[PDB]
Design a protein around this ligand. Structure first.
Ligand SMILES: Nc1nc2c(ncn2[C@@H]2O[C@H](COP(=O)(O)OP(=O)(O)OP(=O)(O)O)[C@@H](O)[C@H]2O)c(=O)[nH]1
Ligand SMILES: O=C([O-])C(=O)[O-]
Ligand SMILES: [Mn+2]
Ligand SMILES: [Mn+2]
Ligand SMILES: [Mn+2]
Ligand code: NA
Length: 610
């Protein structure tokens, strides 16, 4: 199948065999090898020997350091240009812009970024030819979801980054068993390169290959492709997570009738042994991982984690909304993680964990802002920028969105059903974000449609809208996403979860948090649980149902200002409704569903009667 010798890449395979790949996986690999010109092709097996050897290789090259205080833990320090997702370089390609994002009445969209097929083709041609010269192309066969689950979906990621291979081993199920499960089926095609072919054209910084100027994270849902160039970091390189399991998957979910969401999934057991599963969407920086792994303060309750970040949810034959965690690990923010804020994460991350952009202590441990624990005298700190550091210093010792990357099966409170292939039955959906003023600790939506409106009104901070926690992640037009959520009410026999909204972040007149939060949030979960069971524990208000006086267990919290935390001001809510109206008109306009407009007016009307 060639007149010469450059099409068949068999001679460059250094692990596995192209002949044993399913036919369409071989075509994907070989086509991209022809394009990218890697030196070597390594078909990953997912084995512990492969992983160990690749960590040791990175360690020898200076790409990662072993953290000698802990068991098989590692630290990567990046080029400070690479350190986060970059929305302006994250795009979705469709034939028509409006299918990807609504057309905003002014400015640019806050709800996604479209690129034309033409522009993408030019961008691709300016980046990928030859991009892997001198490097190994690793072929990562991975499952998003428990292997073999009816709700799981398989991808193949090609990458030139060992860091990505190691991290994908933690964050997804990868290796030979996935190829076996895939057989001749369909898969999402994921192509990644750090964009630094050898010999290097530009200086390597911190032993971290990246190409910031050309960084581009593209999604082609009608080709079932994700193509990412130039960043080695996080959501830009681990293509299963945000690119596949939110942006691609949300588009698929819309077409097929299910939901792909930026939600934790937790199981909560009351003192009588009754257990329910809840899903919660909070924006980045608003505490999903804390809640998902909560150590409850209320005696007799238990919380167990199914996932901390992404949920795929589909109604079953009996009308239960079943959720799976499509991830295999937790890719959690390190700063702010302490024994007080997340004791179960602290336990989790002491073995088999990769840390990125945190500080290292002189005894080979980790450190970060908010770790809230002192070091022995004499123990010194190296910042994430590889410089000596002391607490008085002007800049943080860890990057603010530095991360740990840890196996889920580790977590001491991992839920027993976290890999059940049928998924767990969701009985409540929680929305929430950071509202320093106005918004009570917890309220319950009046209806499904009201709950969709409440999702649409979420904020990641007082100022910033982040509907459904999906602002950076919508795979398609957010108006159409709202219509898709609203359509669930018309699915016969659907057991629609109860919808709540929480606010951990209300502040008093002095800027102090009114609610202590963290494991105390168990008290709010208890109220939700009773509400799902039909307890008469709610009082009707203009915004939804709130707890009755005395309904929340506040034992141990007598210093809480209840009236203030729980207060609803006409003045605040008049302004809230006007702000929501202006935001939806500006950002959604012609794509805003009937029923969302109707919920906005209904809320305005109820507030007018206060
Ligand atoms: N006051 C208060 N802060 C909280 C609570 N739970 C979490 N936080 C804060 O939430 C932040 C940590 O949340 P993140 O790990 O960034 O949130 P996430 O939702 O997991 O974000 P991604 O992993 O980026 O999706 C820190 O600032 C915490 O102090 C709470 O109950 N009360
Ligand atoms: O990495 C994440 O979870 C994020 O950015 O939301
Ligand atoms: Mn070398
Ligand atoms: Mn998180
Ligand atoms: Mn997230
Ligand atoms: Na480095």
């Amino acid at each position: 199948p060639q007149l010469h010798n450059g099409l068949d890449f068999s001679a460059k395979v250094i692990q596995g065999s192209l002949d044993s790949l399913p036919q369409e996986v071989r075509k994907f690999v070989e086509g991209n090898a022809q394009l990218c010109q890697p030196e070597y092709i390594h078909i990953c097996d997912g084995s512990e020997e492969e992983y160990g050897r690749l960590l040791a290789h990175m360690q020898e090259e200076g790409v990662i350091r072993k953290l000698k205080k802990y068991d098989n833990c590692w630290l990567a320090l990046t080029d400070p240009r690479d350190v986060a997702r970059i929305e302006s370089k994250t795009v979705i390609i469709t034939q028509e812009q409006r299918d990807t994002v609504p057309i905003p009445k002014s400015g640019q969209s806050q709800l996604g970024r479209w690129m034309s097929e033409e522009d993408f083709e030019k961008a691709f041609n300016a980046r990928f030819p030859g991009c892997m010269k001198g490097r190994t192309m690793y072929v990562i066969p991975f499952s998003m979801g428990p292997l073999g689950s009816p709700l799981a979906k398989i991808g193949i990621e090609l990458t030139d980054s060992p860091y990505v291979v190691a991290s994908m081993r933690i964050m997804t199920r990868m290796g030979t068993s996935v190829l076996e499960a895939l057989g001749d089926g369909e898969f999402i095609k994921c192509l990644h390169s750090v964009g630094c072919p050898l010999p290097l054209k530009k200086p390597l910084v911190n032993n971290w290959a990246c190409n910031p100027e050309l960084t581009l994270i593209a999604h082609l849902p009608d080709r079932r492709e994700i193509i990412s160039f130039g960043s080695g970091y996080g959501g830009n390189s681990l293509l299963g997570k945000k690119c596949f399991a939110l942006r691609i998957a949300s588009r698929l979910a819309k077409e097929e009738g299910w939901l792909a969401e930026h939600m934790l999934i937790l199981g909560i057991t009351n003192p009588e042994g009754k257990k329910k599963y809840l899903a919660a969407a909070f924006p980045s920086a608003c505490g999903k991982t804390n809640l998902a792994m909560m150590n409850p303060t209320l005696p007799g309750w238990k919380v167990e984690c199914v996932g901390d970040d992404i949920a795929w949810m589909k109604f079953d034959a009996q009308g239960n909304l079943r959720a799976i965690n499509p991830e295999n690990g937790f890719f959690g923010v390190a700063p702010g993680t302490s024994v007080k804020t997340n004791p179960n994460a602290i336990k989790t991350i002491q073995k088999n964990t990769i840390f990125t952009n945190v500080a290292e202590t002189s005894d080979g441990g980790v450190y970060w802002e908010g770790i809230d624990e002192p070091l022995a005298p004499g123990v010194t700190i190296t910042s994430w920028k590889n410089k000596e550091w002391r607490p008085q210093d002007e800049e943080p010792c860890a990057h603010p969105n530095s991360r740990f990357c840890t196996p889920a099966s580790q977590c001491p409170i991992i839920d027993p059903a976290w890999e059940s292939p049928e998924g767990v039955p969701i009985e409540g959906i929680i929305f929430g974000g950071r509202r320093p003023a106005g918004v009570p600790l917890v309220y319950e939506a009046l209806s499904w449609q009201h709950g969709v409106f409440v999702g649409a009104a979420m904020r990641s901070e007082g100022i910033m809208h982040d509907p459904f926690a999906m602002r950076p992640f919508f795979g398609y037009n957010f108006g159409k996403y709202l219509a898709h959520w609203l359509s669930m009410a018309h699915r016969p026999a659907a057991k629609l979860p109860k919808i709540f909204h929480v606010n951990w972040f209300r502040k008093d007149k002095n800027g102090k948090f009114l609610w202590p939060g963290f494991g105390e949030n168990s008290r709010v979960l208890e109220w939700m649980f009773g509400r799902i069971e039909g307890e008469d524990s709610a009082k009707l208000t203009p915004i939804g149902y709130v707890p009755k006086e005395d309904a929340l267990n506040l034992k141990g919290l007598g210093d809480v200002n209840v009236e203030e935390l729980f207060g609803i001001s006409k003045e605040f809510w008049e302004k809230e409704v006007e702000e929501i109206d202006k935001y939806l008109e500006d950002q959604v306009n012609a794509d805003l569903p009937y029923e969302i407009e109707r919920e906005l007016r209904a809320l305005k009307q109820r507030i007018s009667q206060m």
